[PDB]
């Protein structure tokens, strides 16, 4: 099972590393996208012209007791990002359920609109089953997730503080 990490700073304070386990058996296309966004190895986005990489991206949507969301590397507000395939790719499958906290799952705007945005749940969310593709699990950095989850947000659930992926990468 491949692994990859984010190193997080909040307002430039280093707060720790989130380590992900990806389930590339069940969701190979989805995990390959997420992995390549961690290494940045695929270069410039085909529809966005921005680097296909999470490094320097933010968490732009936070809902306490629900989830934290990031990966919009082109707009930082939920409107952007795209996959390594060029624009969006199909919902690979909905085999894995949102049956626990700390799952990694694809953000979307309807069927088959997977790009680069992802979210991490902080509780079971079964109403999302068959809606968002689950492809991974956080296996370390729970305190980081907690910290991000408790940030003050505005009316659009956007954190006021800078929640920054300062580094990220694929593990051996």
Residue numbers in the entry: 6 to 177
The authors write:
In addition, binding of CsA or derivatives was seen for PPIF, PPIG, PPIH, and NKTR. Modeling of either CsA into the active site of a histidine containing isoform (like NKTR) or computational mutation of the Trp121 in a PPIA∶CsA complex structure indicated that similar hydrogen bond distances can exist between the indole moiety of tryptophan or the imidazole ring of histidine and the carbonyl of methylleucine 9 (MLE9) in CsA. Therefore either residue would be competent for binding, as we have shown experimentally. Conversely, a tyrosine modeled in the conformation to coordinate with CsA created a steric clash with the carbonyl of MLE9 (1.75 Å); in addition, there was a close steric conflict with the modeled Tyr residue and Cζ of the highly conserved Phe60 residue that helps form the proline-binding pocket. Consistent with this, electron density for Phe71 residue in NKTR indicated that alternative conformations are possible for this residue, which may also explain why the PPIA Trp121Tyr mutant was still capable of coordinating substrate in vitro. For instance, the residue that is at position 103 in PPIA varies from alanine in about half of the cyclophilin isoforms to a serine in PPIE, PPIH, and PPIL2; an arginine in PPIG and NKTR; lysine in PPIL6; asparagine in PPIL3 and PPIL4; and glutamine in RANBP2. The occluded set consists of the cyclophilin isoforms with bulky sidechains at the gatekeeper positions; for instance, NKTR has Lys84, Tyr93, and Arg114 compared to PPIA residues Thr73, Lys82, and Ala103. Indeed, for NKTR there were relatively few tetrapeptide combinations with both favorable predicted binding energy and penetration into the S2 pocket; this is easily rationalized by the extremely narrow gap between the gatekeeper 1 and gatekeeper 3 regions in the NKTR structure, which occlude the S2 pocket and restrict the types of residues that can stably associate with the pocket without steric or charge clashes.
